[PDB]
Amino acid sequence: ISPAQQAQADKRARDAAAAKRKQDTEVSNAKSREDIQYTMFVSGLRRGRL
Amino acid sequence: QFKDLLLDPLTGDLDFGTPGDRGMRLALTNQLSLRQRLYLRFAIWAGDWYFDETFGFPYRTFVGKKTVKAVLDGRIKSEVRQEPDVLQITDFQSTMDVVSRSYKCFFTVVTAEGEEISLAFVGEDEYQYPTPPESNVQLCGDEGVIINFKNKLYYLINFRLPK
């Protein structure tokens, strides 16, 4: 081994850890606000569901 | 048979009655009770009554929006059947005018009539307790026993002679 790899393993750990902070954070705030209400329109639309 | 204060069908205020018998009245006949139970249920807009957010009708969904007549009729016809004593709905003439943008429907509802279970809480009693005798009648007899016999004799004397 050499210090050049220690400066490389850190990059592998840092970037990978950054992924959770993105995905894991978004779900946290999405659950911290109950005002938003999602809806889905499966068929229905043109028969007066407009 | 749901009892409640009577609401005047003509004005909407409490039915205090005619000027000769002014007072307060309770809805007794099932017809009158159901009438006002439907009237209040349809007159209160959904969510506008405090202490109960789920009561009322959601007029805001339809009024002011381009809506399909068929969808509205279903909701109108569904709210009626929430009462447990509704037998059926006979006819339904839903019509819509596009010029004035008004909508007006007609229909009738059929409901039976029940019994009163108990009169203890309402007014009168159904029994016929006896009346105490008067004077020395009890210990010595009654004169009516003579009067009825005399009348029977007189009517029998009347019968035999042809008339």
Side-chain angles (χ1 to χ4, degrees), chain B residues 10-22:
Chain B
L10 277 296
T11 67
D13 193 1
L14 311 191
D15 191 355
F16 290 129
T18 62
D21 65 333
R22 289 198 66 75

Side-chain angles (χ1 to χ4, degrees), chain B residues 4-74:
Chain B
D4 191 12
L5 307 190
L6 177 60
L7 272 168
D8 187 358
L10 277 296
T11 67
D13 193 1
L14 311 191
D15 191 355
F16 290 129
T18 62
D21 65 333
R22 289 198 66 75
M24 294 182 286
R25 289 165 184 70
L26 294 178
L28 297 178
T29 45
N30 192 358
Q31 178 170 121
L32 293 171
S33 174
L34 181 45
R35 184 184 64 81
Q36 58 188 64
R37 284 153 57 205
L38 289 171
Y39 172 69
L40 295 190
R41 182 176 281 274
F42 270 102
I44 290 162
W45 295 36
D48 274 303
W49 189 56
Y50 194 90
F51 311 106
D52 210 352
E53 311 325 329
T54 71
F55 193 78
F57 193 101
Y59 293 112
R60 292 289 183 88
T61 306
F62 309 107
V63 169
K65 334 292 281 183
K66 299 208 84 178
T67 189
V68 185
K69 196 181 83 71
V71 180
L72 184 52
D73 302 339

Side-chain angles (χ1 to χ4, degrees), chain A residues 41-50, chain B residues 66-68 71:
Chain A
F41 281 79
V42 286
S43 82
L45 179 44
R46 296 179 180 177
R47 294 181 184 274
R49 291 301 198 205
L50 191 43
Chain B
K66 299 208 84 178
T67 189
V68 185
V71 180

Side-chain angles (χ1 to χ4, degrees), chain B residues 82-101:
Chain B
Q82 290 222 307
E83 299 308 340
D85 57 345
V86 172
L87 272 51
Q88 63 164 60
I89 309 176
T90 62
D91 62 315
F92 207 101
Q93 313 74 70
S94 164
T95 176
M96 189 178 314
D97 163 33
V98 301
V99 177
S100 70
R101 309 198 172 181

Side-chain angles (χ1 to χ4, degrees), chain A residues 3 5 9 11 13-16 19 22 24-25 29-32 34 36-41 43 46-47 49:
Chain A
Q5 292 77 2
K11 301 290 95 175
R14 185 225 63 198
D15 63 358
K22 296 300 306 317
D24 219 330
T25 301
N29 49 274
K31 294 194 301 220
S32 292
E34 71 275 50
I36 288 161
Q37 152 182 30
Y38 295 92
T39 64
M40 293 180 183
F41 281 79
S43 82
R46 296 179 180 177
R47 294 181 184 274
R49 291 301 198 205

Side-chain angles (χ1 to χ4, degrees), chain B residues 39-157:
Chain B
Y39 172 69
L40 295 190
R41 182 176 281 274
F42 270 102
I44 290 162
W45 295 36
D48 274 303
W49 189 56
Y50 194 90
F51 311 106
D52 210 352
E53 311 325 329
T54 71
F55 193 78
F57 193 101
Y59 293 112
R60 292 289 183 88
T61 306
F62 309 107
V63 169
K65 334 292 281 183
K66 299 208 84 178
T67 189
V68 185
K69 196 181 83 71
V71 180
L72 184 52
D73 302 339
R75 180 100 192 97
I76 301 299
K77 186 180 289 293
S78 189
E79 211 76 0
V80 170
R81 323 152 170 281
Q82 290 222 307
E83 299 308 340
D85 57 345
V86 172
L87 272 51
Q88 63 164 60
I89 309 176
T90 62
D91 62 315
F92 207 101
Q93 313 74 70
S94 164
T95 176
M96 189 178 314
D97 163 33
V98 301
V99 177
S100 70
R101 309 198 172 181
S102 304
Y103 170 90
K104 180 52 52 71
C105 70
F106 290 157
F107 63 90
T108 64
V109 55
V110 170
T111 185
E113 169 56 23
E115 57 87 22
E116 182 65 26
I117 210 75
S118 177
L119 289 84
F121 291 114
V122 298
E124 61 285 350
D125 181 359
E126 51 272 31
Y127 285 106
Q128 70 276 16
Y129 308 95
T131 61
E134 293 82 3
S135 84
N136 196 52
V137 69
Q138 190 160 3
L139 278 296
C140 189
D142 163 43
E143 301 305 80
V145 181
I146 315 180
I147 305 301
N148 68 13
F149 195 80
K150 183 72 70 175
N151 284 51
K152 274 147 97 184
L153 178 63
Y154 187 23
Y155 280 58
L156 183 138
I157 294 301

